């Protein structure tokens, strides 16, 4: 029956989507010395937090060296904030890569006996990545644009600390939102779309025994 | 040339107006005998925001503590999480309200700079007002979008007592961010960007030489 194919496909798509959801919620099944995506992301954000602290302490010592002598002074705090922008974007890319690999490994676990479905899954994984990574980057860079709005040593290092604190938390937040949560949700929706064209069901369900 | 005289006069008027907008953007404008500067009035609004968020947080802690006691007399995790989620969601419209309250203050500040500079130059005055209003619309739409986006970002997290401490950890972290990032969004869009775009829109009036006299009409 046409209807039997449809329901088999609903099942395959829906089990894949359940696996993507577990990934998005930090609760996927993993191996003994393996590690969960969510932990991999968290380690990366701890790294971010160490970078931010390196950056604050260097700014501390630069500002000291110039204060041994005003808009010349604030330029150095703002250039110190600015120096986090490309590392912020670098971390966007490294987090995206690990999410993309986890999603691809889910395609593999679910669709390794249906190569046309695995190929189609992967193609959505790449399309959505491109779109969300563009948007992710956009908002990271807007945040740094925003940050560029702010005896004097205390007024400036108080503002350096503030900026450093916002960056520390907000960049990870943006990255998770776009590159795990939105990426994941949109992938699930792009897979459910495969149910629209019932003339493609037989191709999606083609098995290895007859390729 | 009497043409040069004319352009010089218009550049002086536009510059004086633009330096006044800058004075507003930098908390330096001159204020009446017992008035408060625009930048301080924003700071007072953002202090109210802090309080709203603190109250929200303590309200949320109390509501959650009580929910736990009532049950006491992780199958309910989805039920508890909903309480923190809904406390944070309740801050969204107030966040947008503050956006509107603050942009009104800035629009009025900018309009009074326009009155002060251009009320003997009616065409330049109405031209400046129409720019004040078009840029309000544009930046407020953009600020609201970012505020609302921030709130959907927040709807992602990060014994019976460790579920409490977990969910309350999340609430505190979200509270700090909302307290800090919403005023940042508002100030960036509706004072800094608004101010900068207005100034650029006024400089655009120098493009058309044949309009200078009409701008300078002083009858």
Swiss-Prot record, chain B:
Mutagenesis or variant effect for residue 218 to A: Reduced antiviral activity
Stalk, as annotated region: 2-218
Domain of life where this protein originates: Eukaryota
Chain spans, region Middle domain: 1-158
Domain GED span(s) in chain numbering: 160-219
Transmembrane regions listed in the UniProt entry: none
Subcellular location: Cytoplasm; Endoplasmic reticulum membrane; Cytoplasm, Perinuclear region
Inducing or repressing factors: By type I and type III interferons. Isoform 2 is induced by HSV-1.
Domain notes: The C-terminal GTPase effector domain (GED) is involved in oligomerization and viral target recognition. The middle domain mediates self-assembly and oligomerization.
Family: Belongs to the TRAFAC class dynamin-like GTPase superfamily. Dynamin/Fzo/YdjA family.
Task performed by this protein: Interferon-induced dynamin-like GTPase with antiviral activity against a wide range of RNA viruses and some DNA viruses. Its target viruses include negative-stranded RNA viruses and HBV through binding and inactivation of their ribonucleocapsid. May also antagonize reoviridae and asfarviridae replication. Inhibits thogoto virus (THOV) replication by preventing the nuclear import of viral nucleocapsids. Inhibits La Crosse virus (LACV) replication by sequestering viral nucleoprotein in perinuclear complexes, preventing genome amplification, budding, and egress.
Subunit structure: Homotetramer. Oligomerizes into multimeric filamentous or ring-like structures by virtue of its stalk domain. Oligomerization is critical for GTPase activity, protein stability, and recognition of viral target structures. Interacts with TRPC1, TRPC3, TRPC4, TRPC5, TRPC6 and TRPC7. Interacts with HSPA5. Interacts with DDX39A and DDX39B. Interacts with TUBB/TUBB5. The GTP-bound form interacts (via C-terminus) with THOV P5 protein. The GTP-bound form interacts with LACV protein N. Interacts with CCHFV protein N.
Record-given protein name: Interferon-induced GTP-binding protein Mx1
Organism: Homo sapiens
Gene: MX1
Section of the entire sequence shown: 366 to 633 of 662
